[PDB]
Design a protein around this motif. Structure first.
Motif, PDB file in Angstrom:
ATOM      1  N   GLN A  42     -80.734 -20.065 -68.190  1.00  0.00           N
ATOM      2  CA  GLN A  42     -79.939 -20.594 -67.084  1.00  0.00           C
ATOM      3  C   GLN A  42     -78.793 -21.495 -67.353  1.00  0.00           C
ATOM      4  O   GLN A  42     -77.903 -21.600 -66.929  1.00  0.00           O
ATOM      5  CB  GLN A  42     -80.737 -21.130 -65.947  1.00  0.00           C
ATOM      6  N   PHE A  43     -79.185 -22.405 -68.358  1.00  0.00           N
ATOM      7  CA  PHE A  43     -78.189 -23.308 -68.797  1.00  0.00           C
ATOM      8  C   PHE A  43     -77.001 -22.922 -69.491  1.00  0.00           C
ATOM      9  O   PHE A  43     -76.072 -23.193 -69.317  1.00  0.00           O
ATOM     10  CB  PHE A  43     -78.962 -24.636 -69.771  1.00  0.00           C
ATOM     11  N   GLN A  45     -75.845 -19.622 -68.895  1.00  0.00           N
ATOM     12  CA  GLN A  45     -75.008 -19.081 -68.029  1.00  0.00           C
ATOM     13  C   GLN A  45     -74.199 -20.259 -67.214  1.00  0.00           C
ATOM     14  O   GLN A  45     -72.804 -19.835 -66.766  1.00  0.00           O
ATOM     15  CB  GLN A  45     -75.711 -17.917 -67.006  1.00  0.00           C
ATOM     16  N   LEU A  46     -74.599 -21.061 -66.923  1.00  0.00           N
ATOM     17  CA  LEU A  46     -73.897 -22.053 -66.109  1.00  0.00           C
ATOM     18  C   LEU A  46     -72.906 -22.768 -67.257  1.00  0.00           C
ATOM     19  O   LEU A  46     -71.941 -23.126 -66.419  1.00  0.00           O
ATOM     20  CB  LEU A  46     -74.839 -23.119 -65.443  1.00  0.00           C
ATOM     21  N   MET A  49     -70.166 -20.555 -67.081  1.00  0.00           N
ATOM     22  CA  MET A  49     -69.313 -20.447 -65.800  1.00  0.00           C
ATOM     23  C   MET A  49     -68.326 -21.813 -65.859  1.00  0.00           C
ATOM     24  O   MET A  49     -67.339 -21.631 -65.448  1.00  0.00           O
ATOM     25  CB  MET A  49     -70.257 -20.280 -64.514  1.00  0.00           C
ATOM     26  N   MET A  50     -69.171 -22.686 -66.451  1.00  0.00           N
ATOM     27  CA  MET A  50     -68.212 -24.003 -66.470  1.00  0.00           C
ATOM     28  C   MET A  50     -67.078 -23.830 -67.493  1.00  0.00           C
ATOM     29  O   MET A  50     -66.239 -24.647 -67.448  1.00  0.00           O
ATOM     30  CB  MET A  50     -68.949 -25.219 -66.847  1.00  0.00           C
TER      31      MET A  50
ATOM     32  N   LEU B  46     -73.577 -19.914 -58.212  1.00  0.00           N
ATOM     33  CA  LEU B  46     -73.434 -21.235 -59.059  1.00  0.00           C
ATOM     34  C   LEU B  46     -73.611 -22.411 -58.193  1.00  0.00           C
ATOM     35  O   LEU B  46     -74.496 -23.331 -59.120  1.00  0.00           O
ATOM     36  CB  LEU B  46     -71.990 -21.341 -59.512  1.00  0.00           C
ATOM     37  N   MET B  49     -77.673 -22.770 -58.829  1.00  0.00           N
ATOM     38  CA  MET B  49     -78.175 -23.012 -59.841  1.00  0.00           C
ATOM     39  C   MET B  49     -77.837 -24.420 -60.041  1.00  0.00           C
ATOM     40  O   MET B  49     -78.732 -25.245 -60.513  1.00  0.00           O
ATOM     41  CB  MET B  49     -77.540 -22.151 -60.953  1.00  0.00           C
ATOM     42  N   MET B  50     -76.695 -25.037 -59.740  1.00  0.00           N
ATOM     43  CA  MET B  50     -76.457 -26.416 -59.769  1.00  0.00           C
ATOM     44  C   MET B  50     -77.380 -27.272 -58.984  1.00  0.00           C
ATOM     45  O   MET B  50     -77.936 -28.318 -59.264  1.00  0.00           O
ATOM     46  CB  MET B  50     -74.960 -26.917 -59.662  1.00  0.00           C
TER      47      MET B  50
END
Lengths: 53, 53
Positions: A42-43, A45-46, A49-50, B46, B49-50
């Motif tokens: 999950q980290f 994929q985030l 995205m970032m 997103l 997730m955040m």
């Protein structure tokens, strides 16, 4: 002080507790491995995205 | 000035062409709407997730 004294019962109960502890630790360890692996994914994929700033 | 007239035929062809282009605009608009819907789904994902972190 014999090999079959009160000390013997106390110590083999201690050893049985140790082995149950090891088994439970291994089970919870594989569960934690799976969960933390999913969290690290999950980290990832985030972070991807970032990257799209 | 009549229907058989070259200017009238030209403007009839113009309105037919712009109506076909309006159909194309509708197609592009619905494609844009679908893509924006997917993008907003990703944005909400997103955000979730955040929030979990």
């Amino acid at each position: 002080l014999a090999d079959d004294g009160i000390i013997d019962n106390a110590q083999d109960n201690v050893n049985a507790t140790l082995k149950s502890l090891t088994k439970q630790y291994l089970s919870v360890s594989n569960s934690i491995d799976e969960t933390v692996a999913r969290y690290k994914a999950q980290f990832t994929q985030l972070d991807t995205m970032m990257s799209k700033l």
